[PDB]
């Protein structure tokens, strides 16, 4: 159980992108509103709002990693 967050904000272009910068500390713990990282889809930076936990445990896209509209920023923590 982790923040399985990706970039499903595919608007109208798939020229790759970049995780400008997350907003979750190492193993944080949000509640009803987690981090909202900021990627780069060519002028359109989407976000990544989890919904709880957010404990940064596995960020496979640590700010800068290359990603697009469908890849995965990484997984953190979760429950349920």
* Cβ contact 22:52 at 8 Å: no
User: Could you give the domains of the chain?
Assistant: 1-80 (2.40.50.100)
Cα distance from N-terminal residue to C-terminal residue, the chain = 8
* Cβ contact 77:1 at 8 Å: yes
Task: Report d(CA 70, CA 32) in Å as an integer.
Answer: 24
Q: Which residues of 21-55 are buried (b: 16+ CB within 10 A; e: fewer)?
A: ebbbeeebebeeebbebbbbbeeebbebebebbbb
DSSP 49-78: B--SB----B-TT-TT-EE-SSSEEEB---
Spacing of C-alpha 37 from chain mean position: 5
Among residues 47, 58, 51, the alpha carbon closest in space to that of 6 is found at 47
């Amino acid at each position: 159980s982790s923040v399985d967050i990706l970039v499903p904000d595919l608007p109208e272009s798939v020229a790759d992108a970049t995780v400008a910068t997350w907003h979750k500390k190492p193993g944080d713990a949000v509640v009803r509103d987690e981090v909202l990282v900021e990627i780069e889809t060519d002028k359109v930076v989407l976000e990544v709002p989890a919904s709880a936990d957010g404990i940064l445990d596995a960020v496979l896209e640590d700010e800068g990693t290359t990603v697009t509209s469908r890849q995965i920023l990484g997984r953190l923590r979760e429950g349920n």
